[PDB]
Structure 1
Amino acid sequence: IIVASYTANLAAFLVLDRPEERITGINDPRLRNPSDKFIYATVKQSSVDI
C-alpha cells in the first residue's frame, strides 16, 4: 500500500505542468493595471500604437 501510494504520488507529479506560469489573457486586469514586472511593449511608431 505504501509503494502504491508512492507510485501514485510520482505519477501525479508527472501528470500536470505548472498551468499559466505567465499570463496569456489580453483582458487580464493585471495587464490593465500593470506593475513594474510586467514589461510589455511595442515597436515605436507602429500600427499597434495607432
Structure 2
Amino acid sequence: ANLAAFLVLDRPEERITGINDPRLRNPSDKFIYATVKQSSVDIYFRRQVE
C-alpha cells in the first residue's frame, strides 16, 4: 500500500497553466524566464501595466 501511494506522485514540477500562475508573476532567481527581444510580446507586456 505504501509503495502504491508513493508511486502516484508528480515528481516533475506542475505544468504552467498560464499567466495567472503566481510562480510566473512573482520573479525569483531560482526560476528565470524572459522573452527574446523587443518583439510583439514585449509590446503586449508593456501595454498591460500589471
- Gaps of at least 5 residues in structure 2 are 44-50
Percent of residue pairs identical: 100
Corresponding position of 1:25 = 18
Aligned-pair RMSD on alpha carbons? Answer: 2.5
Give the greater-gyration-radius structure (CA).
1
Give the length in aligned residue pairs: 43
Offset at residue 13 of structure 1 (A): 1.6
Name the CA shift for 1:43/1:21 in 2 (closer, same or farther; >3 Å). Answer: same
Measure how far apart 1:31 and its partner are. Answer: 2.1
- TM-score, normalization by structure 1: 0.51
> Hey, which bits of structure 1, 4+ residues long, moved more than 6 A?
none
